[PDB]
Amino acid sequence: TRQMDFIMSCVGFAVGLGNVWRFPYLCYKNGGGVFLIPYVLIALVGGIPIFFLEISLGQFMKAGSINVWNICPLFKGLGYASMVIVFYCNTYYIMVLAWGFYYLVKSFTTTLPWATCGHTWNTPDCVEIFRHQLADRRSPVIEFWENKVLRLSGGLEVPGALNWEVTLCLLACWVLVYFCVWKGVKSTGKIVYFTATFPYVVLVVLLVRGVLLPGALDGIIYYLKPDWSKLGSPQVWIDAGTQIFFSYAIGLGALTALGSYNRFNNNCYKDAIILALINSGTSFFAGFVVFSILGFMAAEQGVHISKVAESGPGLAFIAYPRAVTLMPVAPLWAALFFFMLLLLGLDSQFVGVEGFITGLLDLLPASYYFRFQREISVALCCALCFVIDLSMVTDGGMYVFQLFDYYSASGTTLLWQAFWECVVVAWVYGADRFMDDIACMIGYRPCPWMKWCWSFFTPLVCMGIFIFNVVYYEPLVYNNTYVYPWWGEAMGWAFALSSMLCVPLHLLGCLLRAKGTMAERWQHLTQPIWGLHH
Ligand SMILES: [Cl-]
């Protein structure tokens, strides 16, 4: 009967800010068309196989967080790594909401703030209507993004003064997150439909408008037709692989929990394929929506598409709000779009904080148990994350955000986590045995492509990307202007290492704390710990 409900659950987990904001920004940063080829290749070879692996593993083990790795306890540190990654997400992901929140609070006006060059934050280069020195001029959307919301400083060396307008919005977002996490709201219980169809509808509307703009065809062509000389650069491969591993929540421990929630005999293969296709399609649709507006902007200003908008994380706050200035009733559509953005970000933040706090409290001993341990733990986590984000709501804040975006919960971190997960499942545990278990779970034997991806294809893809980036290293640059100094990249590597060291350190600690020679230690510490069902 109501099979559609299940579908909504899928989209209720699939669409997020990694599709509407990160995918377009990454695509524009690496060039439109050339980014899709590694995207498709990694989605087929690394994305979907790891998606199915994680979902099936969670379903088979019937447990999420760190316990899922009881198939190979020696590598349980993998779970710890995930618990770190999600934490870092909760640190900087909320930042997007704050900026979005700001826009929403500025949306309810008679005329939109980012449509006039007669404000105080604007520069003398602000020109409302473009005509035929001609490069220094900046559109009012860019002025609002880089003069009021961000107040961008010279570089990461100059943090500057705290931005109170965005600080209060960030505090409001964190208080709302705490209130809903403490209440344990049944978000997307039955009204899932709206929370699962409000984005697409709005996006569909945007797409229609995005198509009816002169010069949008050039933007779409730039989005689709690739430049083949950019395939040799390993940066596009990092961006595509990590974007897939980010939008799919691969390595963050989300797919494992989702699998653990399902029934034992549920068709996890179909669920994984459907979820991956939904997520990729949403990313592609957001790509159309952004790039049509980008082509319109490039035609209007007369500059190239690659230089019209910011290659920094502000595309969702430059490409999307600009589109709103074209709709018949701009403030209404601004409020609607940023309300949808806020709802998506809040759902993702709620589930992330729920999972992180639940796992952290699980690992804590019974002696540490406070009276209101849930309330106090959520409050402490939110306060600590707000204190950390105080570094992102300063003038030199976006730079820090970039450091949290490229290096933390992305980049080589996700490659490391995915590679180790594939090695543990396929090699140490046994890919053949896991395939047999999935066959006995869901009935039919999956395609052998899954086994070949777990065993040799995906681990070698991750290792090859990692090696081609370590050998050919390019310092992180923000929006083609700010080349990061040595200490900024050192801090980024500090985040990456704080995430990636969980696996080797856990393995060494487990081996050292065991007894006997290394052979029997390895044999005993990798023995799976089966649950009651198995
Ligand atoms: Cl995606």
Residue numbers in the entry: 56 to 187, 202 to 603
What do the authors report?
Creatine is obtained by the diet or synthesized by endogenous enzymes, and specifically transported into the cell using the creatine transporter (CRT), a sodium- and chloride-dependent transporter, belonging to the solute carrier 6 (SLC6) family. Impaired function of CRT leads to intracellular creatine deficiency, resulting in X-linked creatine transporter deficiency (CTD), a disorder characterized by intellectual disability, speech and language delay, behavioral abnormalities, and seizures. The structure of CRT adopts a typical LeuT fold, consisting of 12 transmembrane (TM) helices, with two gating helices, TM1 and TM6, each divided into segments TM1a/1b and TM6a/6b. We determined the cryo-EM structures of CRT in the apo (CRT-apo), and in the presence of substrate creatine (CRT–creatine) or inhibitor RGX (CRT–RGX), at the resolutions of 3.29 Å, 3.40 Å, and 3.39 Å, respectively.
In the structure of CRT-apo, TM1 and TM6 form a translocation pathway accessible exclusively from the cytoplasmic side, suggesting that CRT-apo is in the inward-open state. Notably, in the CRT-apo, a distinct density has been identified as a putative Cl– ion, with no additional densities observed for Na+ ions. In the structure of CRT-apo, TM1a bends ~33° toward the membrane plane, thereby opening the intracellular translocation pathway. Comparison of the inward-open (CRT-apo) and inward-occluded (CRT–creatine and CRT–RGX) structures reveals that the most evident conformational changes are located in TM1a. The conformational changes primarily involved the displacement of TM1a, a phenomenon also observed in GAT1 and GlyT1 during the transition from inward-occluded to inward-open state. Meanwhile, the Cl− ion remains in its conserved position and is not released.
